[PDB]
Structures are given as C-alpha cells and as structure tokens.
Amino acid sequence: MRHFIIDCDTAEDDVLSLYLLLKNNIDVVAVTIVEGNISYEQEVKNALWALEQVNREIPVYPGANKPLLKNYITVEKVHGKGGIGDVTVEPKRLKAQEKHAALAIIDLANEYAGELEFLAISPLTNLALAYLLDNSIVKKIKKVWVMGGAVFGIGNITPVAEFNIWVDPDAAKIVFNAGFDITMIPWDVIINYPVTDEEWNVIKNMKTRMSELYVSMYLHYRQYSSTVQKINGHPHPDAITTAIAIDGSIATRREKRFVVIDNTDNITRGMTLVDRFDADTSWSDKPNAEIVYEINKKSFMEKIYDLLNWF
Amino acid sequence: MRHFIIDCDTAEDDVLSLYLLLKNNIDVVAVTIVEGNISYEQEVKNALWALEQVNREIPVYPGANKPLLKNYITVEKVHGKGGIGDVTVEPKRLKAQEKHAALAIIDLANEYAGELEFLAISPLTNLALAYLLDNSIVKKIKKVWVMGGAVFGIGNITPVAEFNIWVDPDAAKIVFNAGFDITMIPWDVIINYPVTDEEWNVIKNMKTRMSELYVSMYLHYRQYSSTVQKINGHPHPDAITTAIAIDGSIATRREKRFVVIDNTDNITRGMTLVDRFDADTSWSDKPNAEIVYEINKKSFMEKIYDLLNWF
Amino acid sequence: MRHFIIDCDTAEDDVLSLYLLLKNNIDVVAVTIVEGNISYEQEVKNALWALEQVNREIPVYPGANKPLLKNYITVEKVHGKGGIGDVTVEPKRLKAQEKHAALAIIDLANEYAGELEFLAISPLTNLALAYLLDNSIVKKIKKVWVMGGAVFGIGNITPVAEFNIWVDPDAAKIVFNAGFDITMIPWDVIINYPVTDEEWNVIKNMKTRMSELYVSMYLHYRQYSSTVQKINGHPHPDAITTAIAIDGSIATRREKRFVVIDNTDNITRGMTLVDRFDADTSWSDKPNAEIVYEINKKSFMEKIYDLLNWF
Amino acid sequence: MRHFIIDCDTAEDDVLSLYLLLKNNIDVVAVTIVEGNISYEQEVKNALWALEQVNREIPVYPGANKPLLKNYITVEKVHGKGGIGDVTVEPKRLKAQEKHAALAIIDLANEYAGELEFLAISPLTNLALAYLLDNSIVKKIKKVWVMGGAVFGIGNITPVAEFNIWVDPDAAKIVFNAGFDITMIPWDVIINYPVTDEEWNVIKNMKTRMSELYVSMYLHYRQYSSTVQKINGHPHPDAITTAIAIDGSIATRREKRFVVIDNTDNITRGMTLVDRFDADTSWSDKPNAEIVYEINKKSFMEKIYDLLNWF
Numbered sequence A, B, C, D: 001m002r003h004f005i006i007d008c009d010t011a012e013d014d015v016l017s018l019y020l021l022l023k024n025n026i027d028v029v030a031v032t033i034v035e036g037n038i039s040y041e042q043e044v045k046n047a048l049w050a051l052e053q054v055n056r057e058i059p060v061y062p063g064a065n066k067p068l069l070k071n072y073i074t075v076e077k078v079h080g081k082g083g084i085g086d087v088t089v090e091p092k093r094l095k096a097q098e099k100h101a102a103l104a105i106i107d108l109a110n111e112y113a114g115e116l117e118f119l120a121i122s123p124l125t126n127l128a129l130a131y132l133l134d135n136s137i138v139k140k141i142k143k144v145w146v147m148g149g150a151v152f153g154i155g156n157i158t159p160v161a162e163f164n165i166w167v168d169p170d171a172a173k174i175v176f177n178a179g180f181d182i183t184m185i186p187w188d189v190i191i192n193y194p195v196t197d198e199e200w201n202v203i204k205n206m207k208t209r210m211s212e213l214y215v216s217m218y219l220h221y222r223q224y225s226s227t228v229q230k231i232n233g234h235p236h237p238d239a240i241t242t243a244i245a246i247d248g249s250i251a252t253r254r255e256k257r258f259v260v261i262d263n264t265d266n267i268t269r270g271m272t273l274v275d276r277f278d279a280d281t282s283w284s285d286k287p288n289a290e291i292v293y294e295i296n297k298k299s300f301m302e303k304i305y306d307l308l309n310w311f
C-alpha cells in the first residue's frame, strides 16, 4: 500500500485530486493546508467539507497562512470566493486538528519512514518548514510530486511564473535544494491538455452526484481560464499531477534537469530556470528534479471519467 | 530603394546576411562592428574581407569593443577563431574608417531620415550609444530588425538567455525602452528551422564559389551546433532575420507584445521576459516589439539557394 | 523578577553575557543554540560546559544549524577553534535537550507570556522559525534585545555588514517585520568602546577564577581584533547588549528608526539600512527598532569588573 | 597653469564652484551640463548667465538630459525652481554650443592631454559617455575630482545614497571602473562643516555684489537644509570639493580604498560601498579612489570670504 500526504491551498482541483487518490484506494494519511488560491480559513473548511462527502475522518492540519518572507495575493477571481465558485461551504461535523502541518509532516515521516509520499500541489511553505525543523525527512519521504513551475516561461500568476512557486519562492528554493526525490509537473505543460467543449458536454450529461459536483466546482474556473488565460476549456494542473503519481505511464516524456528558483522580489520572482545541459555555459551538471514534458491525454481523461462514475 | 546599416559581431551568419542584402539589390550604406562572437579586431577584418569578395567599398565603422557596463565572453569555440572556422582572413586593400560607429549611425540617420533601416543582428551597444548621444534617431530610423532573445527561455549562451541580449543587456534595455519600431526574431524560434543533412548535402554538391564558401564558413559551426546545442544541423539566426527584413511573408506568425530585458548580474541576466497580456497580473499593456513566432522554411531556403548560385 | 532566553552561537562574549545575567540574579529560563561563530556541535558543548562552571542545570536547546536559505561561513579564525581560543571544552555531566529551540521558544513564550525577554546576541534563525510556527509570540515576548547590524555601514564580516544579520538575513528580515519590541545594538557603535591596554592589564592582575577565565577566553579574540579589524583592544558586542538589557541607563543615546534588512545574495547582503526620516525621500515613517547610538563606557566597565570579582 | 572642465547640474553650489576656480586664476576651458538638480534647460541657462556676471565667454556644452538607463527625479524643492531660489535667470547674450558635452570632453582631453582636470560635481553621465566613446581619456585626463557618495551610508536623496551617484549609478560604476585618478569628497563628510548662523550673519553684512548674490542664491537651500536634513545651517558639497582641488591642504585626512557602486534598481540604488581592507572578508585589495574624510573648516571658509570680496 502507498501512503500519501496531500498539501492543499484548497480549491476545485485540490478537491478532485484528494478524490482521485481516495477513489483509487491510495492511503491518504493527512491533508495539510497552506496559503494560496483563496482565503486560508475557507481553504481549511473546504478540505473538511470535502472529506465529509466521501465519509472519511482523515485529519486536516492547518499550516502556514502566509509565505516565509514575501507578500502574496489570493486569486478568488480565478477560483471563486469559495474556491469552487462563489459558494462557501462549511463542514457539519469535522474539525481541524490543532497541530501545525509542519509538525504533523515530521511525525508522519517518522511513522511511515521510507514509504511516505508527499503530493505538493500548492505553495511549498509547509514542506519547507518541516524540512527546516527536521532535515532527516529528505530520506524518510520516498517521493515528492510537485505541481509547479513554468519551464518555457509561460506563467499564469505573472507572464513568466507559475502560482505555487511564485507565492513562496523562498520555500520552493529550500525544497529544491534539500535533496528530495522530486518529479515536477509544470503549468506550461499541463495547459496543452485542457478539457475541451466536447469533453465538458459529455460530463454535463453524466448525471451522477460526482459529475454534478464537478460541473458545479469547475464552472467559474472554466469561464475565467477561457476568457483570460485563453485556454481552450479549463486545465487540470493538480489532477494531472495526481494521475501521474498514481500511474506513471500517464507521463510520456520526462527529463532530469537542474532547476533554479528565482526568490528575488524582482520581475522574475518565482521563475523556474531550467538547465538542460545544452547551452554554451551551465550552472550545474547535477540534476535536482525529474520534469514531465508530455502526457497521454486519453489515459488521463479515462481516470477522470472513472472518478465521476463513483457515485 | 531601401537603405540599411548592418551591425555585425562578424562571424559566418553576419557575412551571409550582408551578402543576402547585396545579392538582392538592397542599399547597404554602412557596416558597423560591435563586440560579441569573436575577437573584436578580427571582426573588423572579417567585414572588410567580406566586402572585397563582392567588389564593394561600403564603409566599415568600428564601434564598441566591450559592453557598456558588464563583462562578457567571446565564443570562438562556437564559430572558430576567425568566426568562419579557424582561418583568420585579412583584407588586401580596404581599411576601416576612423569614426566611431555610434557617430556614423547618427550621421546616416540624418542623411536617410525616415528611410534608414537598422539590421541589429549583434549585441546592441552601438545603437544604444547612438541613441544616448541623439535621441532623435528613434524617428529618423524607420525600422530596427533585431535578432535576439529567447521568448520561451530556451537560451544558447546560458540555459535561459540568448547571446546578443546577454552580451550587453544594458544596451538592449536602452534600445527596447527608446521607442524604435522593432521586429524581433528570437533564438528559440529560429532553432526550429535548421539546415538538415539533406539540405547540407545539396549545398555541398552545388560547386559554385559561393556554395564552396558557405560550406567552408559553416563546417565548424555546424559540428558545434549539433554536438552541444543538440540542433539537427545548423541554425541561421541572422540570415532568417535578414530574409524576413527583405520579404516579410517569410514570417508566418507575429505578435505585438511587451518585452522586458533583464539587465542584472544575476542568473537571469539577458533574459527577454515577454508579457502576452494573458496572465493574472501584467507589467504593461503597451507593446514595444513585434515578435516573430513562426516562419515558412521552404521560402527561407529558396532565398538561400538563390544566394549560393550568385557566383 | 525578569525572565530571559539567551540565544547563542556560543563563543567568548556569549559565555560572558550568560554570566552577566546570572551574576546579577536575572532568571535565565533557557539557552538556545544557533549556527554562527564556530562549529555548531561545539557551540552546544560550550554552553553546557559554561553552565557547569556556575552550578546551573538550565536547559540547553539545540536549534538551527544552518541559515534558512543562504550559505554562511564560520569564523574560527576570529574566536579560535573552540570559540574561546583553541581549547575545545566538553561538559562532564550536562546533556542537551532533544526539543528544537524554536519549539522551546514557543513553549516558554506561553509559560511566561507578557514577561519573557529574548536576548538575541546571535544570528536570528531560531526566533524566526519560532515566529513562523506561532505568530502570537510577538505579543507574548515582552522585549527582544538584538546585537546586530552596522548603521554606518562599518561592518565586520564584510566591509558593510555585521555578522549576526549577514549569516541569516532572511531570518533577520522576518524578525524585523514581525512587530516585536526591538532595541538594537550595532557593531559600529560598540567598536567605539574597546577594552584598552590599561583595562586589560588591570584584569590580568585581578587573580580570581573569573578574571583568569576571561583572560583565557579573550586572548585569541583580542589579538585578531587588534591586528585585522584595527580595534584598539577587543570589543564586547554581546556583553554591552546584555549590560544595556540589565541597566538601560548604560545606553546614553537612542533613536527609533525604520530598519530594512538586505536579504539578497548581492554584495550588500546583510546590511541594515536605516531611514532616519531626514532625507529627500523616505521608505516608511513607521519605526520598527530602537537603536542605541552611544553608551557610558565607565558604567559598562563597572559591570564587567563586578562580574570578574564573582569568584 | 592648471586646466579644468567643470561639469554642472547647475544650481547654487555649481555657480559658486565655477566662481572659486575663476576668482583664483584657474583656467576653465569648458562648462558641461548634465541632468540632476533642476530642469535641464534651466541648468544650461544658469551656466550661461553665471559666465556673463564675470565677463567670460567660456563655452557651455549641453550634455545628457537623462541617466543612461534609470529614471531620476529633479529636486527643485531643495534648490528652488531656478536652482538659486525661485528666480529663473536668462543670459542676455551668450548661447550654448551645439556639440554634445561628451564629444567636447574627448576633444579637450586631446587638446590638453596629460594636464586636463575634470571637476565632477554632478551626476557622472557625460564623463561616462565620453569614456565609452574614447577609452584613452583615462590617461589624457590628469585628475577627476568627484563630489559624490555617502561612505557611512548617511545619504541625502535616499536614507543611504547621495544624489550625484544615485541619479546615474550606471554612469558612476563606469567611471569608478575605468581607471581614472579619482579623489572623492562624500556627502556624509561635507555635512560636518556647515555654514553656521554666525558665519551667515557675517556674510549678510559684507555688502559686496558677490556677498549679496551668495545670500540671494543660498537662502532657499539654507531653509530646506536646516528644516529637512537637520543640518545646522547649509552645506557646501561642491565648493568644498572645488576648494580641495585648488588647495589640497584643505583636506586633512585621506584614505585610498576600494569603492563599489550599487547600480541596481533596489533599495540600495546609488550606494557607495567602501572596502577599508579591515573586515573578515574583502572584495578587492586594489583601491580605486582616494576618499577625503576630514577638512580644515577655517581654511575652507577663508577661501569663501576671499571669493565674496571679489566685487
């Protein structure tokens, strides 16, 4: 059995990623919450509410509510006030744990030493804080699956940077320098694989509780993604990362490269600068991340349709 | 009649660009020399020698031999010691002018006010110095055709930056902020259109003086480009820029965008950061450059074969 | 009764500062250890050994052994391999606690809420980590006494920066932005008040255990300070800070100003940039630190002689 | 005979510096104008008008009207709209030369090779541009006398930077790296030597044309300097620099040190960072400037009273 922590700035694609793991009988041992997409206290409530819909009592540990050093902005314009459109949900029964996410990560890394996997689909503040307190988690965590970066400089939050890295580039720099086994899925790869109008219409006609929930959660994000980002539909940054974590054959091209995080407050803040070892100069010959450059869209969407037929 | 200055850090593709203009009856009013690809004094001699092969006495004005502020490196590993392989040519009769290129640019902008075009296929130091001395050249020069940048961060001199901009990013920043009418051809566009083994073999069998010269001038560059940069053949960064300046239909996709030059001494030195007006934040809504994103390869190579049949 | 944590990159002046507090019946509730002056594991042993000489069993909590983000250098050339010259001491009985200093700071801030004082005579990594995990410590800690900075740009570790801030300028920036009640004693103030040859000779003739220990601990530092830094004797950066914490009248000039920490990796790394509200432009009108600009040397040395007569 | 160019962002202390040279029979071969203190076209008119009051026809060459790269602000709040209070003077007869100051500097460096001295009491843009066009001026100019910097980080335009360097720190970096023989007079040295109320009253009672002109030109600057900068009277940054150029014994302490110019757009823009070779690390052991740290106030004021008795 595989054991995962999922780290969430909880909006629509975080909820769907949690569900992809659970639907597929992956052991989710904790959900950790970090600043990012929407108001932090609503992110905590979103996760608790999400667990209730699937009858689970997995602990939710609130973590950092701001970056280590930098200021950031939430993006409720992108995801809705509640992260799933403008509805702001509230759990009926479940309550957040008191312990800080960074301390929970250390405890869980000990309990599941050598087998724990970390699904880093959000800003990296909690993982950085856990590392800073206990450097031994680099061996104890088997694998870090990172949704982050823009490896061709086609960013979302700025023209050249991706949101998760940009929110806390100091935390990202710490994580990328620590020695974790990282596989990274960039924004400017996943935008090549949007959910098309044809696919969206198929989902709207499924009429299961899950398909209805997906339509409800994604409508606002789809409108924004199409109108502002000029994406032909909506993207699945976190759900693609999660699908590859579950089934690695969904990734069809990977390269091990050396990634530098820009942690300045300059215009280049949050950029992922990638040495491919093919230029006239080089920064390092030691790769620190396996980067996914292509996926099998058909295989990915098969996992999504399977999830939406759950109930 | 069109009137051009060509600004050269003279290596193989600068020589071929000069010849493309001359073969095609474009009036080249001066050649200006700038630091870059190889030793500066050999760059001056290369240009004088090149003019001799085609019976012209166009003036050659030596300009800047170092960037405004930064240190740089020459790349004789890429182009050969002489910029056309390891041969180091010497003109028999022609001599360089005494006047600094920046002063010649100002004089020529006055003589050809409203019609002068500037083919900026090299680091931008001379054009920047001319602007700094006389800001009025922004109207007097009709068009600046720039070979420069990496708009997907796929660089040559560093992993993320292109050579011409990286050599003198202060000069580039001055040029991009001045208000010139700029059309820019990036490195990470032109590398999609290498001269293939099939095309190279056709050229090797042509047996004209020009085809023999092309083979001689490009052999070293082709070996390096294939082995280090992993290009399938060799690229034509300057000759593509020149071909588009002559015949704009060679460019098949263009976008007007806002380009920021990174002029730090940090790892991101020399990057061209491009706002496409499609992100959650934006730096400016005022474009400053028309960027070429695609070309017609067949049309471009037709111009090259035509040139090689000259004599 | 006043209650203090003392945070040490333990070398000679940290030992003397601990003793100044204890000699004078200030309640020291913990010693916390941070990276800085010498090898981290020897810093832990130095503190344990120091407590043994005065019959105390105060807990010692090892904290960060490296900066949050940056690389740093130890300075055993300045303080000796063991921080008190080249002797490397070892406690006979006392052992370090297991709990991380940052977690101990949070616990102690709760136990002594509203009365706890923090003597920050070292790099600020532990206090920053404690804040990041629990922001409420800003009210619970009554006062932070900081030895740090160079307010006229007369640095020690670099020409323009002071060691404690330079080692971890990210941690410093976090601390200075958090909202603590800070009084700061700069390097380029304390160097105006060295222990003179006259004073040193008086100490060498005292013949108490404490005076003999002081001579032993300071000989290497005095030689280095005089030969390299060109100080006329040796300075007491931490002991002056501590003396002012005990008796505020030792400070004879203070100003509340706005301090910005340079946390770049550029040449200005670690600078404390001070807005005095007297320039043609201003960064903020909100002070964040009370800075000590002058002391009464006679009063300070009276505290030192008193300490050396303890036993 | 000594031969000088004086480079002016012409306000009150530039006018007085020109007069100090002329009163004392130093050959002023040209006045060059640069962006800085007030509107550029008024700076040109100020210089022409100033020459008329002393019956000279020395050529005035307009130079740069903006920094090489950065934006800047004028400071008419400090000097008055006209740079000498709010009066905006106009020459009756003299006209500016057409030739750019940078080209005039090169011509004059050739005409007076080995003897020309450059009084750089303003932003360094013209000298940088002249160097960039002809690097040989570094030997041909005997001496550069620079009013600039803040060597204890006590700035005027920002809390930590001095105006002349801050306006164009790229130009400053070029000048300080070129190899000129530089003696530098910092802002945070000259502010120790203001014109006191006693001295001001003596001047107000002199009743010569020059004393009346001095009172008229300095009233606005004195009010501002006292109220904002908290100076006890008004300072003479340029006139002190000029006095030392004329009589070196006015400087009573000098040190040869290594000065780095901060040419970023960060908060530290325009800082002069000085390596004294006394820190635990060092940037270079090669000095590039002789810095004046103290003057004889009595000797300086004797030169001023002598000037005011001219007519």
Ligand code: NA
Binding pocket: A007, A008, A009, A010, A011, A014, A121, A122, A123, A238
């Ligand atoms: Na997320």
Ligand code: NA
Binding pocket: B007, B008, B009, B010, B011, B014, B121, B122, B123, B238
């Ligand atoms: Na070129």
Ligand code: NA
Binding pocket: C007, C008, C009, C010, C011, C014, C121, C122, C123, C238
């Ligand atoms: Na310390």
Ligand code: NA
Binding pocket: D007, D008, D009, D010, D011, D014, D121, D122, D123, D238
């Ligand atoms: Na001036």
